[PDB]
């Protein structure tokens with residue numbers, strides 16, 4: 528065991544190994560608070576997230592486990608991975624705190640828009656990397672479910688990583704089928720989000736800034752068109768079906784008339800991502816081979832993930848059971864080679 532040391536940072540205590548120095552709060556992350564730190568062992572800047580009350584309830588305990596499991600599995604250039612996980616606890620009985628260490632990125636996609644002027648070549652590169660990372664997480668039956676600018680982190684290099692996958696305004700980037708639970712969903716819910724993000728990088732404006740679920744759907748159908756007969760057949764919910772057919776019918780628009788002056792190939796890909804029918808929406812693997820990414824696409828360097836075991840998701844266990852499983856995962860963690 529290494530040597531630990533303590534401090535207060537904005538009304539919360541952090542006990543970390545001595546190898547991490549110059550802790551400096553950066554804000555709120557998923558279920559916790561994150562610090563920038565310096566990693567004396569590797570000379571790298573890192574991000575340390577302290578989970579908040581990790582084992583306070585069954586929900587928290589299961590989610591703490593889930594987050595650690597997911598992060599330990601991700602080994603890909605465009606997905607955030609685990610550099611280190613630690614606790615100040617010497618045994619399972621005093622185990623109450625979890626700290627997760629990853630690379631520190633420079634900004635999120637939200638930040639970098641209003642800072643620098645995004646050319647077409649930048650949008651090509653950023654969306655390419657998102658899709659490359661989505662191919663990887665999807666290949667392991669993991670779905671992000673809440674892809675949005677604030678969980679896309681990027682360096683000054685323009686190198687991008689996806690954060691906060693597998694854990695789930697947020698509503699602005701949600702696929703209509705999971706927001707409304709109106710038809711069966713799959714991995715392509717994330718492709719809907721990618722389309723919304725790509726539209727935003729090209730226009731500088733949110734594509735669908737709805738004030739609630741109904742206004743949101745309204746803004747969407749104004750662009751994509753109300754579902755015809757072939758889509759309505761696939762809607763299992765009676766109430767959802769009745770809302771769609773009771774609305775005043777909207778035509779599908781010409782995306783060229785909406786995304787005026789955008790690269791025509793970019794507009795073509797948007798048209799393929801922003802379809803309501805999830806069985807027809809382009810996948811990440813198909814998207815990577817679209818002509819829009821000709822400059823970046825390499826099929827021998829778009830790898831898939833090892834099998835991921837999420838059978839734990841269907842299980843109902845006690846707090847101390849989830850806690851013990853997490854403890855094992857902390858103990859068994861082997862860091863990456865540097």
Ligand SMILES: Nc1c(C(=O)c2cccc(OC3CCNCC3)c2)cnn1-c1ccc(F)cc1
Nearest residue numbers: 553556574576627629630631632633634635680
């Ligand atoms: N690695 C990061 C960041 C970042 O690196 C990040 C994200 C957005 C912006 C950002 O820039 C900072 C540095 C300079 N600008 C302001 C904050 C870093 C944020 N959260 N996490 C994280 C996720 C899971 C974990 F287990 C641990 C940490």
